[PDB]
Design a protein around this ligand. Structure first.
Ligand code: CLA
Ligand code: CLA
Ligand code: CLA
Ligand code: CLA
Ligand code: CLA
Ligand code: CLA
Ligand code: CLA
Ligand code: CLA
Ligand code: CLA
Ligand SMILES: CC1=C(/C=C/C(C)=C/C=C/C(C)=C/C=C/C=C(C)/C=C/C=C(C)/C=C/C2=C(C)CCCC2(C)C)C(C)(C)CCC1
Ligand code: SF4
Lengths: 250, 670, 86, 146, 51, 165
């Protein structure tokens, strides 16, 4: 075995502490401890003080030696070493022990979410719960923009109804004429104007970028997107009018 | 051992770094020598020398702080009106700071007492001394002597540890030992020691002064020998903080002593608990953060957070006697600790970046794009929301439509959680006052407070965005894929890829300093205006309150023009009209100098070093013409140094401007 | 794309080649210096423009000169990562 | 020199040549980019290294293969490998169609090592000051490109 | 000028005060284009584009 | 047990004690047992929020309901329900109705784990061997044991309130 690790006096370092050092230190470093490693000091002293060597030390030299050796509490135990050796294995295997940020910190949720996607080198395929979970996937797929089997005008109508119904509120309330007796027809006009402006922007997008994911086969490129935008304008008008009708009637 | 402590390297400047061994060929060598002076990591020799340097430098700085404390104590014993302040603190401004009668500087000393003229100090040292039971000049003499002895001891220890520690030294790496002994023996066993000090020297003394015996029978009663007074002599039941001491306008010192005793007990019990408590989750943090720069960053962030807590807790949780009425002291104690919180937070970010570049980072750096992206979005959201409520109020007030602005008398944004935050203090439904001065009244939070708190949140988030972006994108980025090899601080990677200026973490700190300064200038202004408008001020015997700003905050701070007019213009009348006025001449002059320095920084901030290098070469032509050859070749400042100088001058000038503006006004009003 | 030109003053350091982060430069044999080699820039379409080659060149004035052309930028000369121009 | 058969990264999921790497958001942005750069090398021991796109990695004792969006990242990883005495690494540019273009050790010899058959491209036979004045070449072939 | 528009009424200098504040904002806004330089923002734009 | 093995090691005082002192699970099929758990977790998850909602409302924090009724509603959560404006209650029902619709029809949980309403099963491992993770079974215990306590707790609140105040 290694020469300097045999018959080392307990006064230099205790048996349990030495075993803890040897466990913490990687095996390949036992023969020649590097430098600034407790094992390096153990070697540099056990080769000077021992049974066949200098058996006594000055009180100050021994005091300084006792403050260079580990104090039996600053060394990781077997379970902690297992924690590290397995945490690093998880991290390198592409799996992340799931954690959630909290009040300046994060709680470990005790879950192994496989992190690297199907393309391990792709940066945007790292799968997370909020985008790649079952609920997230089915929610995104079932949106009007993505729902299967919807004609482009249906997607446009649904999105427009949502936008037009919502956009009335910010104007009819806390608007310039929020306290007038009408106070809602103004909001209706402003919401219809916002719907028209964003529809014009969508028409610009469809006449410049021309997305072709909604076009049926053998059609003018971007025709599906243009139809979706026109029916979004129609749906925005309808939703704004419906919200105004509900506000006035009720 | 100590035979190697030789002066032979004193003449050999730049010895510590092997990049400076070529000699001072250019003037850049001087700046590099100053820049690498404390960078022990990159200096020559093994890692043991790094530990020795770090520990001994810590001891030397501790000796420096002790020397500063000793200087303050000697100023208080031999260059102060602390006697008359003790006799009548409500009529005498603290002053342990004189000015020599040279160049007419005599105009700086002002009337503080009938027998004393000097500069009104706002450090709050007099209140600290009174809370420390210091009455006679001999006590301050011995405090100064003990602080000088501590300075000598710490200096000698710093000298010794450069050779006591060796290559085998390992006591600094024993983090379990450090944490345990620190926690128990200092936070627990020294907190109870201070509790003992208070119970045995303050309660025997401070109640005697509050009992009206400023005489205290000289030493017959003041010099202890008062075991017939009981420890909890005047607790008056109640709850700590609900009822203040009516005489000194502060929490009773018996309650403070009990607090220190209980906090020491709690710290000792936590040290005992740490033998078996919650672990194995911060364990990756435990193993990956054993390095100088990471622990330095952690400690800097912690100390800065504690500093901001101190800033907010020193003002309206009055602990010190006769300190709540001393409004300049309260203002200084809040604002100085606010600035230190900001600066040390920025330093924590910088050393986090340094640790990332030297050590190996952790798991959070791999999803850095979502982190530093949602941070971007939140910064944009609260900037386009908080500030613009000011822009909206401003525009609609200029248009003459006050009913459409965000105010209390208009569309109002109620501070719901703060208004439901009566948990803190929970005092009785009235105010407290000592002598024509308000001690503390609850700040009624309305719309303006809501908007300014959101401004604070926005500025904090943007500064944090800069810091975390520098930290997370230190090793590499989609822009440059080998930022690790470029080091910690570099000007750029070149004009390529469109331009790579200021990608280094050092430049991220450079921007973050500007943003932190902008962040807590608003904090300083919010505090300075809110306290004057709604807390501080005179009183009327009919229970009516006349504040200093006459309630300008709730009616003017809703618009940027209100801040410009009622804070930076109307409240700057004291500092601007401060010439030939005895106390406040230096504050007006320093206001002017701060403006000059702040504008001077812009020369370094806006310009590049190539123009200055070419100008220096043009001048060097004339020097060479007359056979005047500087062999230390004149080179313009390096890009990083230009940015550093610009940032330093910018922050220094702005801080000086605010400093003069607030201090002169509070000295005039008081 | 930028324009990276090599001049006759080259002394075959190979430092410019080693400093290039996108393998724009290369060493070619020549007979105008004691090193019997001069630099060449056969792939300036990959030149981002970092000018590390100019930093590494020890001749009195750089034997390698990079001329920035901003109205000329391609996806390779800009180091585009999130976006493809092909 | 024989170019390898580097397949498109979207068609080589779960390959044995991929080193064990942690995986981060810094990888090439799919769904928007189709041009990928691939670097392959043969190592001797599973020595840990650092990916150019954040996160660390462990090589394989045999062949290795990595995909990156930019040639700069591949060259940075190549320098990092060459610091570990790992030669014989090749960097390929993958076209959208899947065409493989052999880029970095173009002639099989690293660019810092002189190889026969090379010619000084973009060479100018004078000192840098020998360039003609821009004013002289106005409205010629070299209007602003002296 | 500062008294132009306030919580006491407005004068015919209200436009002057509003433009005063707007030009202060414009002057300070150009500081970041002069002090902060490109690479920081290029990384910021890369992050936003990632989003 | 056979079929109760699909919900094994997940109940009882100690985690691996199949309690069932009524035979409610024996003779029942695997899908029925999984559906019984889906009912248990859904009751418990609502019970946990119900208890939290009860306490933040019985202490004096009913802002939306104090700002809608223009008066501080009574602290007693049962009595505060009556005072709460009928518009508020109907919107409360509709929001839960949308959530219940959303989970069931558009984004259905799997049929093997009908309680994965967020759907971690497509990114979770649950079968690895790491210690600093793969404690997902333990956090399943904490959800179930806490939720079961919340179920009897909230009933105690309602029963005591409706009887002994
Ligand atoms: C007063 C000058 C000023 C202003 C306005 C800004 C503004 C900004 N800085 Mg900036 N900065 C400045 C000076 C300034 N900086 C200086 C001097 C430095 C020193 C180097 C920096 C350094 C700096 C850094 C380092 C960072 C910022 C960031 C930001 C952005 C975060 C705040 C935000 O999104 O709010 C929104 C922007 C506003 C201006 C708020 C008001 C918006 C108006 C009032 C509402 C809209 C007007 C309306 C639509 C009119 C339409 C236009 C009209 C033509 C029709 C923002 C664009 C951070 C960033 O971008 O991260 C997100 C960041 O990282 N800055
Ligand atoms: C400046 C504001 C503005 C703009 C840009 C648009 C823009 C548009 N409107 Mg419009 N609209 C507006 C205000 C505006 N609207 C208002 C205030 C009203 C209420 C009277 C309407 C009522 C309205 C109707 C009834 C219709 C449009 C239609 C359209 C589209 C043709 C186009 C997108 C048409 C449309 O969507 O067809 C595709 C259409 O039928 N608008
Ligand atoms: C569900 C369909 C519906 C119903 C029931 C009503 C019902 C009503 N609308 Mg109305 N409206 C609708 C769609 C509808 N609208 C749409 C789609 C538009 C957009 C063109 C409008 C635009 C509109 C205007 C501009 C006005 C009404 C007004 C009215 C009221 C007369 C009545 C309550 C009027 C009213 O009473 O306003 C206060 C009125 O001025 N509506
Ligand atoms: C480290 C903190 C510190 C600071 C900032 C100051 C600052 C000051 N001291 Mg001071 N002092 C300190 C520590 C400090 N002292 C200590 C530790 C002692 C005890 C040894 C003294 C003892 C002392 C005396 C006895 C006097 C001062 C004086 C002064 C003032 C003028 C100094 C002067 O004439 O320049 C001298 C410059 C040099 C010697 C160049 C070196 C100045 C405000 C003087 C003063 O306020 O006059 C009214 C004065 O008479 N100090
Ligand atoms: C934060 C302050 C600090 C800390 C942590 C230490 C820590 C240490 N000192 Mg030290 N020291 C200090 C301040 C400090 N000193 C100061 C201010 C002085 C000057 C009086 C000294 C003078 C001193 C001497 C003379 C010796 C130590 C020694 C030691 C070591 C053992 C002493 C012990 O048990 O405790 C230990 C590493 C001893 C040592 O190195 O042990 C071998 C030793 O001989 N110190
Ligand atoms: C049981 C004895 C006791 C007593 C009498 C006090 C008394 C005090 N504490 Mg305290 N404290 C105690 C135990 C005690 N503490 C313990 C055990 C802890 C550990 C959790 C703390 C942690 C603590 C903090 C963190 C702070 C106080 C503060 C205060 C002061 C403000 C009191 C107030 O407004 O309360 C209202 C009720 C007051 C002097 C504050 C202070 O110092 O104000 C400047 C403050 O910030 N205490
Ligand atoms: C406990 C606190 C602490 C400690 C121990 C360190 C330690 C260190 N820092 Mg550091 N830092 C800190 C706080 C701290 N810092 C804070 C709060 C900030 C934020 C501003 C920084 C920002 C910072 C940066 C940006 C950098 C460091 C660097 C360094 C390293 C070398 C420092 C050096 O050689 O400078 C030598 C010392 C000086 C040059 C001091 C010059 C004086 C300063 C610059 C101006 C002060 C003006 C003064 C206050 C006003 C004058 C008064 C006027 C009236 C005349 C070293 C490890 C550098 C490094 O490379 O790290 C490895 C580096 O690049 N730090
Ligand atoms: C909605 C109620 C509900 C449902 C459907 C389940 C369902 C389940 N529990 Mg369970 N449990 C609940 C509430 C519920 N629990 C509560 C509140 C507690 C705390 C005491 C427990 C404690 C518990 C333990 C300790 C264990 C289970 C187990 C199980 C599983 C085995 C099937 C079973 O026990 O009978 C399913 C059928 C029912 C529970 C029928 C509901 C009760 C009927 C209707 C009569 C109860 C009426 C009651 C007396 C009066 C109501 C008021 C009351 C509060 C006083 C199954 C998934 C076992 C398991 O999976 O471990 C592996 C197990 O060991 N449970
Ligand atoms: C089982 C779940 C549950 C149910 C059925 C209710 C039902 C109700 N709550 Mg409630 N609440 C819950 C959980 C629940 N709460 C939780 C977990 C909290 C803590 C955040 C609250 C906090 C709360 C407050 C503060 C108030 C109510 C109020 C109300 C009543 C009016 C609806 C409303 O404004 O809700 C609003 C509910 C929220 C804003 C909480 C959102 C948190 C969700 C559950 C996170 C997912 C209604 C009876 C109001 C009332 O007047 O009570 C009588 C009221 O002011 N709740
Ligand atoms: C807060 C909340 C939330 C959210 C929510 C939301 C987002 C909502 C929305 C809502 C909405 C947004 C709704 C809307 C609706 C709409 C509607 C309901 C519409 C309708 C329309 C109509 C019906 C129309 C019709 C028409 C047409 C189409 C045309 C012609 C004319 C007429 C009128 C006939 C969450 C969950 C996050 C959480 C918490 C709570
Ligand atoms: S660094 Fe300059 S001198 Fe050296 S080989 Fe390259 S171009 Fe020639």
């Amino acid at each position: 075995k290694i020469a300097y690790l045999q018959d080392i006096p307990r006064t230099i370092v205790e048996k349990d502490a030495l075993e803890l050092i040897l466990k913490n230190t990687p095996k390949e470093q036992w023969e020649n401890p590097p430098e600034d490693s407790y094992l390096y000091t153990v070697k540099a002293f056990a080769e000077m003080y021992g049974p066949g060597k200098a058996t006594k030390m000055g009180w100050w030299d021994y005091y300084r030696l006792k403050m260079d050796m580990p104090d039996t509490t600053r060394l990781s135990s077997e379970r902690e070493l297992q924690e590290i050796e397995e945490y690093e294995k998880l991290m390198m295997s592409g799996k992340v022990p799931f954690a959630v940020p909290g009040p300046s910190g994060y709680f470990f949720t005790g879950f192994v979410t496989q992190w690297k996607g199907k393309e391990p080198f792709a940066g945007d395929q790292v799968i997370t719960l909020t985008e790649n979970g079952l609920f997230a996937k089915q929610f995104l797929s079932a949106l009007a923009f993505y729902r299967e089997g919807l004609k482009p005008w249906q997607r446009g109508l649904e999105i427009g109804m949502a936008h037009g119904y919502f956009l009335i509120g910010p104007f009819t309330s806390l608007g310039p004429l929020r306290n007038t007796p009408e106070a809602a027809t103004v909001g209706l006009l402003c919401g219809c104007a916002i719907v028209g402006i964003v529809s014009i922007g969508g028409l610009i997008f469809g006449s410049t970028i021309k997305p072709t994911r909604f076009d049926k086969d053998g059609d003018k490129p971007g025709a599906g997107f243009i139809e979706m935008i026109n029916w979004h304008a129609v749906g925005g008008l309808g939703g704004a009018g419906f919200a105004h009708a509900l506000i006035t009637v009720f | 051992i100590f035979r190697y402590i030789n002066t032979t390297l004193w003449a050999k400047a730049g010895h510590f770094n092997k990049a400076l061994s070529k000699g001072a060929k250019t003037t850049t060598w001087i700046w590099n020598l100053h820049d690498y002076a404390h960078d022990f990591d990159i200096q020559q020799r093994s890692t043991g020398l790094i530990a020795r340097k770090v520990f001994s430098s810590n001891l030397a700085h501790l000796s420096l702080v002790f020397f500063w404390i000793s200087g303050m104590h000697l100023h208080g014993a031999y260059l102060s009106n602390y006697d008359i302040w003790l006799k009548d603190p409500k009529s005498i401004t603290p002053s342990s700071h004189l000015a020599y009668s040279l160049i007419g500087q005599d105009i700086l000393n002002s009337y503080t007492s009938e027998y004393f003229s000097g500069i009104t100090i706002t450090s709050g040292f007099f209140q600290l001394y009174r809370s420390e039971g210091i009455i006679t000049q001999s006590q301050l003499k011995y405090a100064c002597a003990t602080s000088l002895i501590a300075t000598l001891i710490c200096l000698s220890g710093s000298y010794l540890h450069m050779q006591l520690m060796s290559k085998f030294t390992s006591f600094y790496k024993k983090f379990q030992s450090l944490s345990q002994d620190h926690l128990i023996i200092i936070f627990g066993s020294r907190s109870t020691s201070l509790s003992a000090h208070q119970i045995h020297k303050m309660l025997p003394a401070n109640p005697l002064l509050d009992s009206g015996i400023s005489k205290p029978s000289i030493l017959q009663v003041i010099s202890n020998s008062l075991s017939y007074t009981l420890a909890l002599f005047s607790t008056n039941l109640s709850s700590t903080g609900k009822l203040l001491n009516p005489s000194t306008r502060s929490v009773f010192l018996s309650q403070v002593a009990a607090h220190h005793k209980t906090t020491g007990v709690v710290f000792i019990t936590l040290g005992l608990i740490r033998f078996l408590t919650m672990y194995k989750s911060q364990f990756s943090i435990l193993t990956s953060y054993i390095d100088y720069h990471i622990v330095l960053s952690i400690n800097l962030a912690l100390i800065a957070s504690l500093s901001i807590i101190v800033a907010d807790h020193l003002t309206r949780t009055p602990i010190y006697p006769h300190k709540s009425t001393s409004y300049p002291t309260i203002l200084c104690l809040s604002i100085h600790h606010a600035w230190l919180s900001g600066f040390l937070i920025i330093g924590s970010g910088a050393h986090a970046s340094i640790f990332n570049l030297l050590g190996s980072p952790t798991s959070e750096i791999r999803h850095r794009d979502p982190i530093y992206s949602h941070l971007i979005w939140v910064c944009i959201a609260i900037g386009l929301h908080s500030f613009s409520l000011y822009c909206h109020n401003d525009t609609l007030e200029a248009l003459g439509r006050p009913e459409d602005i965000f105010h209390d008398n208009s569309i109002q944004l109620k501070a719901i959680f703060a208004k439901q935050s009566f948990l803190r203090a929970e005092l009785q439904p009235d105010i407290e006052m000592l002598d024509k001065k308000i001690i503390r009244i609850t700040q009624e939070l309305g719309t303006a407070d809501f908007i300014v708190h959101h401004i604070h949140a926005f500025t904090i988030h943007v500064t944090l965005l800069i810091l975390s972006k520098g930290v997370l994108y230190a090793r590499n980025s989609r822009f440059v894929s080998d930022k690790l090899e470029l080091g910690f601080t570099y000007p750029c990677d070149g004009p390529g890829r469109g331009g790579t200026c200021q990608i280094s973490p050092w430049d991220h700190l450079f921007s973050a300093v500007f943003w932190m300064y902008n962040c807590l200038n608003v904090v300083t202004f919010h505090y300075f205006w809110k306290m004057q408008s709604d807390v501080w001020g005179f009183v009327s015997i009919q229970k009516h309150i006349s504040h200093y700003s006459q309630g300008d905050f709730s009616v003017n701070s809703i618009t940027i023009n209100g801040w410009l007019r009622n804070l930076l213009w109307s409240e700057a009348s004291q500092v601007i009209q401060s010439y030939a006025l005895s106390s406040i001449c230096p504050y007006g002059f320093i206001f002017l100098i701060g403006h000059f320095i702040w504008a001077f920084s812009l020369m370094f901030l806006f310009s590049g070093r190539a123009y200055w290098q070419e100008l220096i070469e043009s001048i060097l032509w004339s020097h060479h013409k007359l056979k005047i050859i500087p062999h230390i070749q004149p080179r313009a400042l390096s890009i990083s140094q230009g940015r550093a100088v610009g940032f330093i001058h910018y922050t220094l000038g702005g801080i000086g401007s605010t400093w003069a503006f607030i201090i002169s006004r509070l000295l005039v009003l008081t | 794309s930028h324009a990276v030109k090599i001049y006759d003053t080259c002394i075959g350091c190979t430092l410019c080649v080693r400093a290039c982060p996108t393998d724009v430069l290369e060493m070619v044999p020549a007979s105008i210096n004691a090193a019997k080699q001069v630099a060449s820039s056969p792939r300036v379409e990959d030149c981002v423009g970092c000018k590390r080659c100019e930093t590494a060149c020890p001749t009195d004035f750089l034997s390698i000169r990079v001329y920035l052309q901003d109205n000329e930028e391609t996806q390779y000369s800009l180091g585009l990562d999130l976006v493809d121009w092909s | 020199v024989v170019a390898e058969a580097i397949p498109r990264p979207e068609d080589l999921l779960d390959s044995p040549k991929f080193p064990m790497f942690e995986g981060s958001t810094g990888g090439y942005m799919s769904r928007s980019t189709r041009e990928r750069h691939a670097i392959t090398w043969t190592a001797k021991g599973q020595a840990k290294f650092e990916m150019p796109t954040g996160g660390f990695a462990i090589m394989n004792q045999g062949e290795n293969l990595c995909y990156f969006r930019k040639k700069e990242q591949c060259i940075a990883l190549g320098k990092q490998l060459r610091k570990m005495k790992i030669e014989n690494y090749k960097i390929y540019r993958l076209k959208k169609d899947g065409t493989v273009i052999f880029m970095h050790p173009a002639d099989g010899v690293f660019p810092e090592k002189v190889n026969k058959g090379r010619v000084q491209v973009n060479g100018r036979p004078f000192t840098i000051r020998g360039n003609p004045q821009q004013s002289e070449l106005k409205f010629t072939k070299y209007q602003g490109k002296g | 000028l500062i008294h132009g528009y306030s919580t006491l009424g407005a004068n015919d200098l209200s436009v002057q005060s509003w433009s005063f504040l707007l030009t202060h904002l414009a002057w300070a806004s150009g500081f970041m284009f002069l002090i902060s330089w490109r690479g920081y923002w290029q990384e910021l734009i890369d992050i936003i584009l990632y989003i | 047990r056979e079929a109760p093995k699909v919900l094994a090691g997940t109940g009882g005082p100690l985690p691996e004690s199949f309690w069932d002192p009524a035979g409610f699970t024996n003779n029942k099929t695997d899908e029925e047992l999984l559906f019984y758990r889906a009912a248990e977790l859904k009751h418990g998850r609502i019970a946990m929020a119900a208890v939290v909602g009860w306490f933040t409302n019985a202490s004096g924090f009913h802002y939306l309901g104090d700002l809608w009724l223009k008066k501080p509603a009574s602290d007693n959560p049962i009595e505060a329900f009556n005072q709460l404006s009928l518009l508020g209650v109907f919107q409360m029902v509709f929001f839960i109705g949308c959530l219940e619709w959303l989970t069931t029809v558009p984004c259905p949980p799997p049929k093997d784990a009908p309680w994965d309403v967020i759907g971690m099963s497509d990114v979770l491992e649950e079968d690895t061997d790491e210690n600093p993770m793969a404690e997902y079974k333990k956090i399943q215990m904490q959800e179930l044991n806490n939720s079961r306590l919340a179920m009897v707790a909230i009933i105690g609140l309602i029963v005591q309130a409706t009887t002994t105040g």
